[PDB]
Design a protein around this ligand. Structure first.
Ligand SMILES: O[C@@H]1[C@@H](O)[C@H](O[C@@H]2CO[C@@H](O[C@@H]3CO[C@@H](O[C@@H]4CO[C@@H](O[C@@H]5CO[C@@H](O)[C@H](O)[C@H]5O)[C@H](O)[C@H]4O)[C@H](O)[C@H]3O)[C@H](O)[C@H]2O)OC[C@H]1O
Ligand SMILES: O[C@@H]1[C@@H](O)[C@H](O[C@@H]2CO[C@@H](O[C@@H]3CO[C@@H](O[C@@H]4CO[C@@H](O[C@@H]5CO[C@@H](O)[C@H](O)[C@H]5O)[C@H](O)[C@H]4O)[C@H](O)[C@H]3O)[C@H](O)[C@H]2O)OC[C@H]1O
Length: 404
């Protein structure tokens, strides 16, 4: 049965990981997790997201392909870093290394880049040109990518050691220093190096920063990352307070100021959507809250955040002619961007690790568990989230500490 009383002590401290699928009475859990990985990383052109990159017939590395029918397929740091994370959680070392090799070679901007803000950060969007060679479309970073890269590399160091192709640990420390020096403002993760007083709630994963604190050597850096963790929980708490009730109606948003205030409308040239939309980025916020609750302990704010957000989505479904909650809301109003897909449902299943409502658990978990693994033209985002969620709800998303 669903544990509606999540412990205030996290799995990272206790070593005790919940298996949410088991709590919900599901069978063949680990087999389903395994087939999810195998299908995503297999050469089937169906669920597949993991593709080899070759130059003149010579194998180089692998990437996660952000399949895109409208705008052309591209390659993204977040997809890449999530792929590495999935691989390390299931002890899939070749897949990890092939993805990391690609990132280090083709996504990393040179440390001597003329623009100091780009030095050592990871170009968020690549494509293959008309001859099949990789190039950077936008050299700017999407910092959730670097966050996951650092997280995946620290875990790889811990599981596999550092005597093979990669010194994972040294690569992780370099990544952490890049985040600190290039991708933070006042110890809050940036949306961009080029815009101040701006964050993206979905980039906040407080437990990762605690994990970083425990895996650096020097005292100043340990304290730095602990402060980032505290400030991240405060940002998310403040954001959830601000979106409570009218006018945001309990869903977190795409963009936020550093005090947690949703960004209203447009604020910069190139901006994809209005700041106050619950949209594709924002889907992940309560998933991150669930992650944090599970790994570092469930506090009153985690519970309130997820209970109210899932509560709104359940309500929204009853007022929908197609009996679904939708992909995009603004100020509590549906923006007609379609019924929720697999990635959004996946995000909401992970949020249940902070839920105290068995009725929400039954509804949201079964809607995720009944899905087939994503296929077709929109499988990049849906499929990547689906993979992460499969790890989170099966007790397979763990923190592996390094030893010193
Ligand atoms: O110079 C600076 C610029 O570099 C800067 O650029 C920003 C860099 O960060 C970018 O953020 C990432 C964008 O990608 C997000 O994930 C998306 C979410 O959407 C998914 O696509 C949807 C899937 O579902 C379909 O139904 C729907 O139609 C799709 O839209 C997509 O697959 C994912 O990759 C990441 O979360 C972000 O981190 C940002 O876009 C850039 O603006 O901007 C500032 C400038 O000064
Ligand atoms: O566009 C705007 C419209 O969106 C707006 O409509 C309003 C939207 O919100 C509606 O209210 C929702 C009611 O349900 C809430 O979820 C609750 C949260 O609490 C849960 O209870 C917890 C369960 O577990 C216990 O252990 C725990 O102690 C409890 O706290 C409960 O199960 C959920 O159902 C949603 O968060 C609300 O959004 C409201 O009725 C609409 O009017 O109207 C204006 C328009 O502009």
């Amino acid at each position: 049965a669903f544990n509606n009383n999540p412990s205030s002590v996290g799995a990272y401290s206790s070593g005790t990981y919940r298996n949410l699928a088991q709590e919900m009475g599901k069978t063949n859990i680990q087999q389903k997790v395994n087939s999810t990985f195998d299908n995503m990383f297999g050469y089937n052109n169906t669920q597949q997201l993991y593709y080899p990159y070759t130059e003149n017939g010579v194998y180089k590395a692998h990437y996660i392909k952000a399949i895109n029918p409208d705008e052309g397929d591209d390659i993204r740091t977040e997809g890449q870093s999530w792929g590495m994370t999935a691989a390390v959680m299931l002890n899939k070392q070749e897949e990890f290394d092939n993805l990391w090799r690609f990132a280090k070679a083709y996504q990393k901007n040179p440390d001597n880049h003329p623009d100091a803000k780009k030095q050592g950060v990871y170009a968020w969007k690549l494509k293959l040109n008309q001859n099949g060679f990789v190039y950077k479309v936008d050299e700017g970073p999407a910092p959730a990518g670097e966050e996951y890269f650092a997280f995946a590399l620290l875990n790889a160091s811990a599981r596999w050691g550092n005597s093979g192709e990669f010194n994972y640990y040294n690569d992780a420390i370099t990544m952490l220093n890049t985040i600190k020096n290039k991708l933070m403002e006042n110890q809050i993760i940036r949306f961009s190096p080029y815009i101040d007083n701006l964050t993206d709630p979905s980039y906040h994963i407080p437990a990762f920063y605690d994990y970083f604190a425990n895996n650096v050597t020097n005292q100043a850096d340990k304290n730095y990352w602990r402060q980032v963790a505290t400030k991240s929980r405060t940002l998310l708490k403040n954001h959830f307070t601000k979106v409570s009730g009218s006018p945001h109606w309990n869903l977190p948003t795409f963009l936020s100021r550093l005090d947690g205030s949703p960004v209203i409308g447009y604020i910069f040239n190139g901006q994809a959507n209005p700041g106050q939309w619950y949209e594709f980025d924002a889907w992940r916020v309560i998933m991150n809250v669930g992650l944090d609750a599970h790994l570092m302990g469930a506090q009153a704010w985690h519970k309130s955040a997820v209970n109210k957000a899932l509560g709104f989505l359940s309500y929204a479904k009853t007022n929908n002619s197609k009996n679904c909650y939708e992909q995009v809301y603004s100020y509590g109003g549906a923006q007609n961007r379609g019924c929720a897909g697999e990635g959004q449902k996946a995000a909401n299943a992970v949020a249940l690790l902070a839920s105290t409502n068995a009725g929400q658990a039954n509804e949201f978990f079964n809607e995720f568990w009944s899905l087939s693994q994503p296929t077709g033209d929109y499988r990049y985002y849906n499929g990547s989230l689906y993979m992460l969620a499969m790890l989170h709800v099966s007790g397979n998303f763990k923190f592996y500490n390094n030893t010193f």
